[PDB]
Design an enzyme around this catalytic site. Sequence first.
Site, short mmCIF file in Angstrom:
data_model
loop_
_atom_site.label_atom_id
_atom_site.label_comp_id
_atom_site.label_asym_id
_atom_site.label_seq_id
_atom_site.Cartn_x
_atom_site.Cartn_y
_atom_site.Cartn_z
CG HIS A 46 0.64 -8.52 -5.75
ND1 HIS A 46 0.22 -9.81 -5.99
CD2 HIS A 46 0.60 -8.29 -4.41
CE1 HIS A 46 -0.06 -10.33 -4.81
NE2 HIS A 46 0.14 -9.44 -3.83
CG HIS A 48 3.50 -8.28 -11.27
ND1 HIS A 48 3.92 -9.60 -11.32
CD2 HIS A 48 2.39 -8.20 -10.50
CE1 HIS A 48 3.05 -10.28 -10.58
NE2 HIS A 48 2.12 -9.48 -10.07
CG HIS A 63 5.24 -9.62 -6.48
ND1 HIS A 63 4.54 -9.48 -5.29
CD2 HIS A 63 4.64 -10.59 -7.22
CE1 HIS A 63 3.54 -10.34 -5.35
NE2 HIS A 63 3.56 -11.03 -6.49
CG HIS A 71 4.95 -11.64 -0.85
ND1 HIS A 71 4.46 -10.64 -1.66
CD2 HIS A 71 3.91 -12.29 -0.27
CE1 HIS A 71 3.14 -10.72 -1.57
NE2 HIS A 71 2.77 -11.71 -0.75
CG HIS A 80 8.09 -8.03 -2.90
ND1 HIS A 80 7.39 -8.98 -3.61
CD2 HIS A 80 9.09 -8.64 -2.23
CE1 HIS A 80 7.99 -10.13 -3.36
NE2 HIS A 80 9.02 -9.98 -2.53
CG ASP A 83 4.63 -7.43 -1.30
OD1 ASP A 83 4.40 -8.00 -2.41
OD2 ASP A 83 5.46 -7.87 -0.47
CG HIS A 120 -2.25 -12.07 -8.51
ND1 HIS A 120 -1.41 -12.93 -9.19
CD2 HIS A 120 -1.66 -10.86 -8.40
CE1 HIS A 120 -0.32 -12.22 -9.45
NE2 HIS A 120 -0.42 -10.98 -8.99
NE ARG A 143 1.95 -12.98 -13.18
CZ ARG A 143 3.21 -12.60 -13.33
NH1 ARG A 143 3.53 -11.70 -14.24
NH2 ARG A 143 4.16 -13.11 -12.56
#
Lengths: 153, 153
Positions: A46, A48, A63, A71, A80, A83, A120, A143
């Site tokens: 993702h 951020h 995000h 999401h 998003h 995403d 992630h 993370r």
Amino acid sequence: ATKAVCVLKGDGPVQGIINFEQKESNGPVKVWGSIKGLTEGLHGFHVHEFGDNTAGCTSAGPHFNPLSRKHGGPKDEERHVGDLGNVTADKDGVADVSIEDSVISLSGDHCIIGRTLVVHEKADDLGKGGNEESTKTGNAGSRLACGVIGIAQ
Amino acid sequence: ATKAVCVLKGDGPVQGIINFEQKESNGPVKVWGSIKGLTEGLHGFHVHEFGDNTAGCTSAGPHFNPLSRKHGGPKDEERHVGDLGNVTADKDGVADVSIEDSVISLSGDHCIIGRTLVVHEKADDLGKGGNEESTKTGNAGSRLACGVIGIAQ
């Protein structure tokens, strides 16, 4: 053609180099590279909101969602901007990234330069995990590694 | 007021946090923070063209100089956009930064978001060093620490 790069680093063995290229401002962004030190399986990938790494990967914030949507997966209409779904790591913990995305951009409103790319702990459930957390972060967990997306040559 | 941040890291003990704030698009950029692990005295403080950290601080490339000008001090008319002069480290190796600059920007042609901020080995001679290298890099030497300039909260 606008080019960008991201060097992924974390507290563990997770490391990687991710390249971005957008030949046309209204065209798709090609995102490719490799990430090592991952557990076998799928990992949430993702963008951020903040290019802030003052207190590690947590300071990157939520995000990147400038449209304030739910999401979802990258092929979904409701997602998003950040995403990008999942990256799949092999048995030796190496994830070979090759993604084409038309929602993210290297210029304008959906510009991801100066923001943080995060890999992630777990798979992103793509908003179909059956709980409140799934509709926000996709239950992707911790993370593992992150980096600020910077302008490349 | 658009905000930016940079986390400085290298192969040595040099580590720092630098903030950037631009209240108005045409207005000056307030740059503040602290850098530690520095030798006492002056150290070159420059914005380099690329936000590329794939091969450490070397991959950041040359100074951010879109107007193709000669190197100078931040108060000079003849300077690179990235010419932020020198930071001063005390006897304990700590450099308190409080700079205001009207050449760098967090938008437009002179935008430094996604570029690299670098703290150098030696003092920047501000183009008054008396040699060919002085008008190019200011003889600031090696790249102690760098970080990609990212969007902040």
